[PDB]
Paper text:
A gene fragment encoding the catalytic domain of AfAA11B (residues 1–219) without its native signal peptide was cloned into the pBSY3Z-P DAS2 vector. An almost complete structure at 1.26 Å resolution was obtained, with a copper ion bound in the histidine brace. The β-sandwich is comprised of two β-sheets, one consisting of four antiparallel β-strands (S3, S4, S6, S7) and a smaller one consisting of two antiparallel β-strands (S2 and S5). Looking specifically at the active site, AfAA11B shares common LPMO features, including the universally conserved histidine brace coordinating a copper ion (His1 and His61). Despite the observed differences in substrate specificity between AA11 LPMOs, their second spheres are virtually identical, with all three AA11 structures having a tyrosine occupying the proximal axial coordination position of the copper, as well as an asparagine and glutamate. The closest contacts of Glu139 in the wild-type enzyme are 2.8 Å for the tyrosine and 4.5 Å for the copper.
The catalytic capabilities of lytic polysaccharide monooxygenases (LPMOs) were first discovered in 2010 and LPMOs have since garnered significant attention due to their unique catalytic power and biotechnological applications. The histidine brace is a unifying feature of all LPMOs, whereby two histidine residues in the LPMO coordinate the copper ion found in the active site. Previous studies have shown that AfAA11B from Aspergillus fumigatus has exceptionally high oxidase activity, low reduction potential and the ability to degrade soluble chitooligomers. Adding another unique feature to AfAA11B, this enzyme has the lowest reduction potential and highest oxidase activity of any characterized wild-type LPMO.
Author numbering: 26 to 176, 198 to 244
The structure:
């Protein structure tokens, strides 16, 4: 149970910590009433700028693995096409063995980053954070935020809301993580070589 803090998600005041519905019904972005209201301040990401990726919550579930992905859709739906710009395998959204202290609203001390790469054209996008928790029930977490990019990619990995089911206890390694892959966890938790993520 975690949520993205930066970049600021759409409709943050109605955005909760819960994972996506196991049946896929609220993929993408936790579909719900008025799900796609932009925050007041525009999140501007210059190409090549190191941008913050930060979280709120203490129920870190031993970490896991995350992606950062972009779509041109400003009201994403099941038909939205996503472009992965970063994969974090292990240690996301925290490199601890279980949960942390603080409440549902605590700023997560473990912080991350992403950079818009050279192949993304300037324009408005939705950015998604997705997270596959290491410990606990097999879930997929997802929050979405508008960003404006100012002056060839894998499709998003989707699991646990379909037939692809991940293995409990491991930091998964995405089949097609892209050219920007970061390992932020303990090597002993990385999914063993030769096992598929599903
Ligand atoms: C982004 O975060 C990763 C993981 O902590 C770190 O290795 C890297 O140095 C960070 N980038 C910058 C520019 O600080
Ligand atoms: O509505 C918008 O207009 C500009 C657009 O030019 C961005 O590509 C901007 O920053 C918005 O949020
Ligand atoms: Cu949880």
């Amino acid at each position: 149970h975690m949520k993205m803090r930066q970049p600021t998600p759409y409709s943050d005041s109605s955005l909760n910590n819960s994972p996506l519905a196991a049946d896929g019904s609220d993929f993408p972005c936790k579909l719900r009433d008025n799900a796609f209201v932009p925050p007041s301040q525009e999140t501007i990401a210059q190409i090549g700028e190191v941008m913050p990726l930060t979280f709120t919550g203490s129920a870190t579930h031993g970490g896991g693995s995350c992606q950062v992905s972009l779509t041109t859709d400003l009201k994403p739906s099941k038909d939205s096409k996503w472009m992965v710009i970063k994969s974090i395998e292990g240690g996301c959204p925290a490199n601890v063995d279980g949960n942390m202290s603080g409440g549902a609203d605590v700023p997560d001390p473990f912080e991350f980053n992403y950079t818009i790469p050279a192949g993304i054209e300037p324009g408005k996008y939705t950015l998604a954070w997705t997270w596959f928790n290491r410990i606990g029930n097999r879930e997929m977490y997802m929050n979405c935020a508008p960003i404006t990019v100012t002056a060839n990619f894998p499709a998003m990995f989707v699991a646990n809301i379909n037939g692809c089911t991940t293995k409990e206890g491991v930091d998964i390694r995405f089949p097609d993580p892209g050219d920007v892959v970061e390992y932020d966890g303990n090597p002993s938790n990385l999914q063993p070589a030769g096992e598929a993520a599903c």
